[PDB]
Chain length 186, copies 3
């Protein structure tokens, strides 16, 4: 069938805000829903995790198995941004260098958590099995390929691939005009 | 212990067809069972997702977290094909180029979904964390490595790796002799 | 909210041994708890799988989606080791070469399972979306970057990346003084 909440059960979750035509899987996890807000026409699929401060506009699909670790600073997606399956977005990560201790079992004073808001601008697409690390803006109209890793802010309207990513090609801007056409008839 | 459904629970599912000794996780998601056939001696683990048209033969393991998105055209596996953990197989995929809007929140006329049957032939093995794209015939006896990305059909009896995959060596065919012998015991 | 067991429900799983302050998601899967041991201050998140023989010490996070397939020979992590999200550790994998049949639907005669203990020593961290294969000792202090693949044992206090991994730099050892200072103030 499908595993989505009814519009009725959504209201019971306690989101900061949730628009219309919001389909969220019952097999997703939602932690601290009072700091999570969703526009209209959002779909979030089985085995996703939203945890902490996350904000999603409208016309966004968060595909299956995707984790959004919004922490305190948060993750924000703008309209028409989509995220394919099995992606992680971190707004916070532990320091790997060996200069600090690590992870939730250890108190803050021994760790060196790197944290910064993450933003996906309008029309961003994030390819399957990718990772986005903290304190990064993914530019307007940016496509990130499958299995790619992003550690820095990405320039608008390009397609990036690889670990860590590299620019390979301009993204076509035809979507801008299609979005105007779509909005019209809606 | 294990999380597999009963023969009794399995029949309650409504599969287009289910064979014998089928072990399906209660923690998998099965969408539109009505279009899904499974032969004999098949195991499907936790957190898999089968959605839309998916045909599976016999002697096949779909390991944990693997998503098979058959859509309309479908995904087929021949006998002795196996898929290791956290793989995605897409029978349909959105246009990443920027020539078109994307994903299930948006109507089809604004999109440009690529679709085509995906076929895994006999003795195919797909390594963990791999991705197969639409309209791809994975040749008989092909092995694709961990973390593989497959956008195009793959010639029989080869080992491939990488993103996207390249052909690194031949697969031996000794496995065909062992199939014939296994069958002759059985 | 959070999705962990109370310390009461923990005792009802029948681990070879569970310590105190042990947070385990109800959305995780635990097979054969009889051969699994867990020290103290350990968190195991949603959609993890622990199957067969698994030994975790103290001060360890096993992040979401992570799968530890310990089979019979086992996976052992020492204290202050952590695994980030969507990692797989295998103590047994099947032969990809074509010399043998594959997976849990086939009798052992016809297979050529590679087995070998996996050990992660003190302060190891494994980055997200990584894979560690059988018979590998990850030396004390090792860091493996995200989206990496490990088929061989790794030297102490080095940072490794890639598929399969290459050494890129020394790990800083300030973490050795920090554990001292932290353990003391307790
Ligand atoms: C990123 C992508 C769009 C590029 O496809 P393309 O426009 O057809 O370009 P090509 O396949 O010609 O690749 C161009 C270069 O990028 C490399 N490349 C392509 N995809 C890559 C990836 N995901 N990671 C690393 N390298 C990649 C190719 O090797 C090639 O390298 P070269 O120039 O050195 O030969 C596509 O490869 C991809 O990753 N799609 C992801 C689809 C997806 O995740 N869908 C989720 C459901 S909507
Ligand atoms: C692909 C695989 C079979 C190759 O192993 P191998 O035949 O033992 O070959 P090697 O390890 O010598 O590697 C051959 C070349 O391919 C590369 N390579 C190997 N595995 C690769 C992978 N998964 N991704 C990218 N490259 C890989 C090596 O770098 C080497 O490159 P070079 O010739 O340019 O140096 C193995 O690496 C693998 O990926 N196994 C997957 C195991 C799995 O997914 N198991 C699930 C549980 S059953
Ligand atoms: C491994 C890691 C610590 C390296 O970071 P760094 O020390 O800042 O090193 P740099 O980013 O300058 O990269 C050094 C080299 O490694 C390459 N590289 C870095 N990380 C890589 C990775 N994960 N895979 C493949 N290559 C990688 C870089 O391209 C660069 O190569 P070059 O010398 O050929 O240019 C980091 O990139 C990483 O993977 N962190 C994972 C964090 C994680 O998984 N967190 C989970 C939540 S806590
Ligand atoms: C994955 C999933 C599916 N379902 C149900 C409801 C859905 O309408 C139905 C089928 O959805 P589906 O995801 O199989 O098919 P689509 O509705 O076409 O969606 C998908 O294909 C596109 C081409 C990709 N770009 C998407 O990333 C991919 O997830 O099954 C759920 O209820 N929950 C889920 O998590
Ligand atoms: C993963 C999984 C396991 N189980 C139960 C039933 C099983 O008999 C038992 C142990 O299964 P396991 O999958 O850990 O181990 P195996 O049955 O040996 O299979 C595994 O190792 C092989 C070498 C790989 N080729 C497989 O891909 C891997 O999944 O646990 C479940 O009930 N559901 C599951 O999803
Ligand atoms: C992921 C997850 C979270 N939770 C709840 C209880 C937790 O205390 C709360 C916060 O968990 P969280 O994982 O969103 O956030 P943190 O407690 O900061 O943990 C995370 O950020 C760090 C920088 C990383 N090193 C970790 O690997 C990452 O998972 O949400 C659960 O109940 N179950 C879960 O699986
Ligand atoms: Cl996953």
């Amino acid at each position: 069938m499908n595993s989505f909440y009814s519009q009725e059960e959504l209201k019971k979750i306690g989101f900061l805000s949730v628009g219309k035509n919001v389909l969220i899987s019952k097999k997703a996890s939602i932690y601290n829903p009072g700091v999570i807000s969703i526009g209209n026409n959002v779909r979030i699929d089985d085995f996703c995790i939203l945890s902490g401060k996350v904000t999603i506009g409208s016309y966004s699909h968060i595909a299956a198995y995707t984790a959004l670790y919004g922490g305190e600073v948060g993750i924000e997606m703008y309209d028409f941004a989509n995220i394919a399956s099995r992606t992680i977005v971190y707004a916070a990560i532990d320091d790997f260098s060996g200069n600090a201790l690590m992870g939730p079992t250890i108190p803050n004073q021994y760790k060196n958590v790197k944290t910064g808001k993450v933003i996906l601008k309008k029309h961003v697409i994030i390819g399957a099995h990718s990772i986005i690390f903290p304190n990064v803006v993914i530019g307007e109209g940016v496509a990130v390929g499958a299995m790619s890793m992003v550690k820095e802010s990405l320039d608008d309207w390009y397609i990036y691939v690889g670990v860590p990513v590299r620019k390979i090609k301009a993204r076509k801007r035809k979507i801008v005009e299609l979005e105007n056409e779509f909005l019209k008839s809606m």
